[PDB]
């Protein structure tokens, strides 16, 4: 199923849309996960919030200015911390003639401009804001409470990891970027574009992720020497033309306001914002993720990087392998094509 591992789009009915975990299992039954990324368009009758006009005073405590350095499809992005600002102020800048989206016809045009201009006129990204724009009463696909097994971390050990088991908000402007990465602990992430201009994505199938890694180590050998997991630093940008040149399979997709993107364990992805917009995101899990989390290769070189104890997941969901794993003897080989166990239905 989905042998091309191309990014799939889904249009669930409200009935199917109601149960989050269940629907993720469904799209996995259709091979969605093979692409590393999937889009889900909500029922048109569905909205997370009534009006966004009341958020103008919302504080973005730590905007970052993205200074990209490099050439020929290979870049390293540096972040400059900026003083806090309100959504109102941020929007002013995003729409200012200096930072506004350029003119263009077809996305392919805007895309060529992004890759041409990204090292010029460093933009400001309204990233990693703690919070949610969901109304408290919305029970479908609520990034605040998705009720997946990732909830076990909090339930068991009381541990909160912001952005991972709590929601983040992202206020983008033209040419703001997210570098190539998989999620912390190779989890899933969910991303909802509340409003504004599009967000475009690139994705490498999990079954090809190791090839991207090898390519990246070759391009940035100093960085790979210093840390195995260096891509987790989220500083590495690589153009689609470069992927093509080196024969890394990938697909692209553009996410529009009102649409969800789902990323899947060990799906590498990267992208950029088209212009002023706002997205909400967090991580989540399924039973299938557990083996990924056990095998995730993590950043060594920075302190306090996100690390989740798998012990609770292995004891609960792999009791038969628990002693083996604790002994370092668990040899399980991940098969990226296999759907989550919940898809039996």
């Amino acid at each position: 199923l989905n042998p091309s591992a191309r990014i799939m789009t889904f249009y669930p009915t409200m009935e199917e849309f109601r149960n989050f975990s269940r629907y993720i299992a469904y799209i996995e039954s259709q091979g969605a996960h093979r692409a590393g990324l999937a889009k889900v368009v909500p029922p048109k009758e569905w909205k997370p919030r009534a009006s966004y006009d009341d958020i103008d005073d919302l504080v973005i405590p730590a905007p970052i200015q993205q200074l990209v350095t490099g050439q020929s499809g290979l870049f390293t992005q540096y972040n400059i911390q900026k003083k806090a600002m309100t959504v109102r102020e941020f929007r002013k800048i995003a729409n200012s003639d200096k930072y506004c989206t350029p003119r263009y016809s077809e996305f392919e045009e805007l895309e060529r401009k992004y890759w041409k201009n990204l090292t010029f006129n460093p933009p400001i990204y309204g990233a990693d804001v703690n919070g949610t724009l969901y109304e408290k009463h919305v029970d479908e696909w609520n990034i605040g409470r998705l009720r997946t097994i990732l909830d076990l971390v909090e339930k068991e050990s009381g541990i909160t990891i912001e952005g991972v088991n709590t929601p983040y908000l992202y206020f983008g402007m033209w040419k703001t970027s997210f570098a190539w990465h998989t999620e912390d602990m190779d989890l899933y992430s969910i991303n909802y574009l509340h409003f504004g201009e599009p967000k475009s994505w690139y994705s490498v199938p999990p079954e090809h992720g190791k090839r991207l890694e090898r390519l990246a180590k070759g391009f940035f050998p100093g960085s790979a020497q210093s840390c195995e997991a260096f891509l987790r630093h989220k500083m590495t940008l690589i153009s689609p033309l470069m992927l093509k040149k080196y024969g890394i399979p990938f697909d692209k997709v553009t996410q529009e306001a009102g649409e969800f993107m789902i990323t899947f364990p060990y799906g590498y992805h990267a992208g950029f914002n088209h212009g002023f917009n706002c997205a909400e995101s967090t991580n989540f899990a399924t039973r299938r993720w557990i083996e990924y989390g056990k095998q995730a290769v993590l950043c060594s070189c920075r302190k306090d990087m996100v690390k989740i104890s798998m012990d609770v997941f292995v004891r609960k969901f792999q009791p038969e392998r628990y002693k083996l794993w604790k002994a370092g003897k668990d040899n399980t080989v991940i098969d990226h094509t296999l759907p989550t166990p919940e898809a039996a239905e």
Partner: peptide, 8 residues
């Protein structure tokens, strides 16, 4: 620990 999207 926190999730962070940006390099440095």
């Amino acid at each position: 620990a926190r999730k962070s999207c940006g390099g440095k």
